[PDB]
Amino acid sequence: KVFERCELARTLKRLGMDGYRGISLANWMCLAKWESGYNTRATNYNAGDRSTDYGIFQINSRYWCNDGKTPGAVNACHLSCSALLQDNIADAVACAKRVVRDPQGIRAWVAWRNRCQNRDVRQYVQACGV
């Protein structure tokens, strides 16, 4: 599923993401936007280390979900990577929350550092009623 902007903002808000571990909804939107273009079926293979990025937040198989084919990987979210490819983002949200419970927080994603950190992210939630 490819969410429309405001549709996703309200979906994330309903799922308890607004201010989760101090991260505003606008930051999560900026993350999903740059990671996948709000596309829940997005996948990206990393030939360098044999891991794959899954879903709307492009969560990696080396540490967060199990796909059975990533060498020496772990599954911190205790989910099959398949769960991160659903139209319903509840599981992906639960895993993204798990990610930010770690020391780095929202900085876990390099894309957030490149396109969202120290930027005006208000534009991502404007007119969405969130």
UniProtKB/Swiss-Prot annotation:
Record's function text: Lysozymes have primarily a bacteriolytic function; those in tissues and body fluids are associated with the monocyte-macrophage system and enhance the activity of immunoagents.
Superkingdom as given in the UniProt entry: Eukaryota
Active-site residues (renumbered): 35, 53
One of the protein's GO biological processes: defense response to Gram-negative bacterium
SMART domains per record: LYZ1
Protein family per UniProt: Belongs to the glycosyl hydrolase 22 family.
Its EC number(s): 3.2.1.17
Cited InterPro entries: Glyco_hydro_22, Glyco_hydro_22_CS, Glyco_hydro_22_lys, Lysozyme-like_dom_sf
Enzyme class: hydrolase
Reaction it catalyzes: Hydrolysis of (1->4)-beta-linkages between N-acetylmuramic acid and N-acetyl-D-glucosamine residues in a peptidoglycan and between N-acetyl-D-glucosamine residues in chitodextrins
Note: Lysozyme C is capable of both hydrolysis and transglycosylation; it also shows a slight esterase activity. It acts rapidly on both peptide-substituted and unsubstituted peptidoglycan, and slowly on chitin oligosaccharides.
Associated disorder: Amyloidosis, hereditary systemic 5: A form of hereditary systemic amyloidosis, a disorder characterized by amyloid deposition in multiple tissues resulting in a wide clinical spectrum. AMYLD5 primarily affects the viscera, and the predominant clinical features are renal dysfunction of varying severity, and intra-abdominal bleeding. Inheritance is autosomal dominant.
Keywords carried by this UniProt record: Amyloid, Amyloidosis, Antimicrobial, Bacteriolytic enzyme, Disease variant, Disulfide bond, Glycosidase, Hydrolase, Secreted, Signal
Subunit (UniProt): Monomer.
GO molecular function: identical protein binding; lysozyme activity
Protein name (record): Lysozyme C
Disulfide bonds: 6-128, 30-116, 65-81, 77-95
